[PDB]
């Protein structure tokens, strides 16, 4: 379906409930006359920047909020502005995930954490630690069973373990992300990847395990474990399988770390439909009915609406769902996030086939996930160099008053400069505060070609 | 103008035994009729850069080996080819200092590291570590005298605490320096640093004192400890202080680590008396009498000649010279090592003034050190990107089958070659060869636009 005025078209990804969305936005036709249509396209979150401004994009995105940073960077998402009310019925930390450079950019719908999922019949008493689960693999195997299954192809998935030693993205500092600072190849990422890796060699699990394959193992009941999310609880329901949902096993002593992700809905900032989505959103999603019509599909999690969640909180696997997510850290919503992922899904990918080393394979992730900031720098530098020096001068006490001591300034040429803001303010900071005051020097030429 | 043809000019540090030094000149003199004149410019280790980049400057410098790789690469030293049984008469690990892509630059004359020196009178039993020095100066205050002076101007002299508890230049792996991984801001960096600051917050020490003030302080026997090297020694020998040359003191339980210096003896490249300057330097100074003359003046330190040091090395102020140097590091000779310096000097500066803070410093310290790579790397970048598709894949191949594997190549874009190959050759090599490739794939142009580049 085509975005087109006077009608909605929604995008969600496959593994949520999208057959009870669908059953919002029929309540809401019931009752407005306006048509809404749900779709779930494949790699839909790979897609959207390609067709945002078109009419073969959505309407309205659905996607966790470590995306929208990105989106919302390259202009593609429209500003939210909820009344008070509105805003006081959701968790404050679910709006902070959707919060990008001082604005709403998405509506947060709920909490997502991975938690251990496993076969009470099979395993009564599961594993709290990573390094118990070889010889729990070998006694299954002699039953013709495995002790874990999950997908090896995400990195979502392998993520917890590679953080619980200490492995992380991007280090918080200074009250932001610092992108140069990328911890993907320290001691504790290693420990964790090769102990990944260990098990693969040594037979207990397969490194073409996907999701489907972890899904159709477990709910057949072929497997005792596997790790997945709240969506997945639904066809596990449906299953023959008594399953129990729980805090994720410690590595060297350590809690596993998963990445928690808010499933948000943004708004095209292309869509002539702006209003009306705001409308869908606010007024029959986001409320009881409407997120309950979506729990009863495939669960959302906790969900960000105060009045429901409290009702859900009281669900054990919700509560195992909190607790993982409380051990983890929330994913932040930078737009290099992006390809920090893509760099971590092909060293997990390659360590795991046994095509590099994960000594190998992180350090190509660590270089690949930095480029970020050398790619900010050297363009920061580039416009910077072409400033009078007497336009430097100006550009440096200005840089005061726009919100770095002159001392550390006086002495700086244009690449040290960029040093400077990018560091203090980061990278999407430092360009905006450049390109304003290249327009208070004298030189809108710079401004006009940074806008492009 | 060129160097004047038939004599030898010798710049040294005026800290060195430079009298010494002219009496091995004259030495020559009285063998061969060639005159040696030896002077002691300020700030010389800056001025050679300058003077000798346009083919003037003196005959031979002498400065620590951290220095000669940044001439070298800027054409400044003509290469050492010493003999075997020359070269057999040198330690081993002194030729290594003087080694810049794979040749021999200079000739190593001695081992410097820095020693803890104290006073026996006023601290019969130096302290085990930093932390104590506090408390041993509440005590020297009530009897008009201080624990501790050095020179807080220079960072050699405040690094060995930096580093103590972690804090590094550029970090070492593979027999190579990695310079985008700068270690002058990491917490070992900043605890050592903050342990300086709070000395002088709590009026333990001066945020001005320096090299001078603290030699007469420590000469005059006002003040119970200094650090210094061994050519500092001939001055307290001269003074009335009864003195001892130790260990430094540890921090958080680890050694002291001092950068390791060679002093060093570079041919200018532009000299026409390269001939005599190796005579002067094989057969005269790198000799017994030799090193005997320049130590005498004022002490090298442990000398580079096997012969030599043998005898030096029962004293045991060069045994805790040697032990210090142990715990300490030689420094790299990379030609980043000027900007490190530059960069940590601004920063203890700053911080011991209270100007900065300690996480200020040296975040902008770090930030300074780590310049060299990303200025090599803007600018290779942006010239790769003036390649088009085909020409880049033609520079590619070049760089594949020339007399870096394919698959770290084939897909990247011009600012990760960019990183390949800095990472792979060092920021001058890589430059230097992606210019000379341009020239071979039909971009004859960016290399002559390049060739004009700074
Ligand atoms: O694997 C990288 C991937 O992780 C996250 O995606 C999750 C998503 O948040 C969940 O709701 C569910 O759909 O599983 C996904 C993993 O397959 C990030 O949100 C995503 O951006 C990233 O690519
Ligand atoms: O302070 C930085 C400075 O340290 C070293 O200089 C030493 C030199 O090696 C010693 O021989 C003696 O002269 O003291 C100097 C410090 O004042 C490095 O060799 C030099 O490059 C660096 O700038
Ligand atoms: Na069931
Ligand atoms: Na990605
Ligand atoms: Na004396
Ligand atoms: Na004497
Ligand atoms: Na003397
Ligand atoms: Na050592
Ligand atoms: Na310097």
Redesign the interface.
């Known amino acids: 379906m085509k975005i087109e005025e006077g009608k909605l078209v929604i995008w969600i990804n496959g593994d949520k409930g999208y057959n009870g969305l669908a059953e919002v936005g029929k309540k809401f036709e019931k009752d407005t006359g306006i048509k809404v249509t749900v779709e779930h396209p494949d790699k839909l979150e790979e897609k959207f920047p390609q067709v945002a401004a078109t009419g073969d994009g959505p309407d309205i995105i659905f996607w966790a909020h470590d995306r929208f940073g990105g989106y919302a960077q390259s202009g593609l998402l429209a500003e939210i502005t909820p009344a008070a009310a509105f805003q006081d019925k959701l968790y404050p930390f679910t709006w902070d995930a959707v919060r990008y450079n001082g604005k709403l950019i998405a509506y947060p719908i709920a909490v997502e954490a991975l938690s251990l999922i496993y076969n009470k019949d099979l395993l009564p008493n599961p594993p709290k630690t990573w390094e118990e689960i070889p010889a729990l693999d070998k006694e299954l195997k002699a039953k013709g069973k495995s002790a874990l299954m999950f997908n090896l192809q995400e990195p979502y998935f392998t993520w917890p373990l590679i953080a619980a030693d200490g492995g992380y993205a991007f280090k918080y500092a200074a009250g932001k992300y610092d992108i140069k600072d990328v911890g993907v190849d320290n001691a504790g990422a290693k420990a964790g990847l090769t102990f990944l890796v260990d098990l693969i060699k040594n037979k207990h699990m397969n490194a073409d395990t996907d999701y489907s394959i972890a899904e159709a193992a477990f709910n057949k009941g072929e497997t005792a474990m596997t790790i997945n999310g709240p969506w997945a609880w639904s066809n596990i329901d449906t299953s023959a399988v008594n399953y129990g949902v729980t805090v994720l096993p410690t590595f060297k002593g350590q809690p596993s770390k998963p990445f928690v992700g808010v499933l948000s809905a943004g708004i095209n900032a292309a869509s002539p439909n702006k209003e009306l989505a705001k409308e869908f959103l606010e007024n029959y999603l986001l409320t009881d009915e409407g997120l309950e019509a979506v729990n009863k599909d495939k669960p959302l999690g906790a969900v960000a609406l105060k009045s429901y969640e409290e009702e859900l909180a009281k669900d054990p696997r919700i509560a195992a769902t909190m607790e993982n997510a409380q051990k983890g850290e929330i994913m932040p919503n930078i737009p290099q996030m992006s390809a920090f992922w893509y760099a971590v899904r092909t060293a997990v990918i390659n360590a795991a086939s046994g095509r590099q080393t994960v000594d190998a394979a992180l350090a190509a992730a660590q270089?690949n996930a930095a480029?970020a900031f050398?790619?900010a720098?050297?363009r920061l530098?580039?416009y910077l160099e072409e400033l009078e020096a007497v336009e430097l001068k100006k550009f440096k006490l200005y840089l005061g008053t726009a919100t770095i001591?002159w001392?550390?300034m006086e002495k700086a040429g244009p690449?040290?400069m960029a040093?400077?803001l990018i560091?203090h303010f980061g990278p999407e900071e430092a360009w905006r505060l450049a390109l304003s005051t290249f327009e208070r020097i004298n030189r809108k030429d710079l401004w006009e070609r940074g806008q492009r």
């Open positions: 270089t480029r050398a790619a720098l050297c530098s580039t001591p001392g550390s690449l040290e040093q400077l560091t």
